[PDB]
Amino acid sequence: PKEVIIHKNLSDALKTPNEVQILDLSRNQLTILPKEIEQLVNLESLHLRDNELTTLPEEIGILKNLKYLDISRNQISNFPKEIQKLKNLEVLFLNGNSLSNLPEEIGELEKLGILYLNNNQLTTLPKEIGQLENLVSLSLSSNKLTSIPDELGQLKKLRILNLWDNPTLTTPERNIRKLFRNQEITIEIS
Ligand SMILES: [Cl-]
Ligand SMILES: [Zn+2]
Ligand SMILES: [Zn+2]
Ligand SMILES: [Zn+2]
Ligand SMILES: [Zn+2]
Numbered sequence: 001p002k003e004v005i006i007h008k009n010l011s012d013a014l015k016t017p018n019e020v021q022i023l024d025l026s027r028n029q030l031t032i033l034p035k036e037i038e039q040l041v042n043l044e045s046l047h048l049r050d051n052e053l054t055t056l057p058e059e060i061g062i063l064k065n066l067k068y069l070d071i072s073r074n075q076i077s078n079f080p081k082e083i084q085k086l087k088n089l090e091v092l093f094l095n096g097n098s099l100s101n102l103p104e105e106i107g108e109l110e111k112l113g114i115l116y117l118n119n120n121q122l123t124t125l126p127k128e129i130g131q132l133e134n135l136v137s138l139s140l141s142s143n144k145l146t147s148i149p150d151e152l153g154q155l156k157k158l159r160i161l162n163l164w165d166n167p168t169l170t171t172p173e174r175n176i177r178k179l180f181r182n183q184e185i186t187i188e189i190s
């Protein structure tokens with residue numbers, strides 16, 4: 001049973017916490033996500049787009065059923081290690097944030113299939129990015145990339161790698177393509 005009338009208010013969601021499948025707090029001028037989010041144990045989708053967040057509380061790791069997390073258009077610069085507990089996460093929108101580095105824990109999102117990192121200030125990816133075995137689409141457009149780790153070549157299900165608008169990346173196109181020599185993939189390099 002899917003939720004079609006989604007929840008848009010945290011206080012109301014907390015009145016019947018086991019009931020809530022989708023919570024949308026986008027454009028709520030949040031500077032912090034309240035710790036009480038951990039009460040929504042059955043949450044599957046959390047939208048926090050266009051807030052003023054700089055991180056997530058460590059309580060996020062209690063949301064083990066989460067499949068979709070939209071934190072786009074915030075000022076996110078770091079994550080708690082507890083993000084590694086989001087083992088059911090399939091889609092992560094991190095576009096439009098303040099990321100200059102991704103933590104090693106990003107590589108622990110075992111079921112992640114789609115990762116959007118457009119419009120951040122990343123200079124590289126951690127070696128642990130190669131642990132995302134189910135990743136199909138990785139978008140890194142408009143970042144500050146200077147290198148791509150060889151471990152990216154471990155992503156055998158990757159079908160789209162988008163590197164548009166990274167003029168700082170001096171890495172030759174042939175070297176990038178060589179990481180995925182045999183594999184079915186389209187690589188977008190400006
Ligand atoms: Cl949203
Ligand atoms: Zn309700
Ligand atoms: Zn959203
Ligand atoms: Zn922690
Ligand atoms: Zn699924």
Ligand SMILES: [Zn+2]
Nearest residue numbers: 159183184185
């Ligand atoms: Zn095909």
Ligand SMILES: [Zn+2]
Nearest residue numbers: 187188189190
């Ligand atoms: Zn193209």
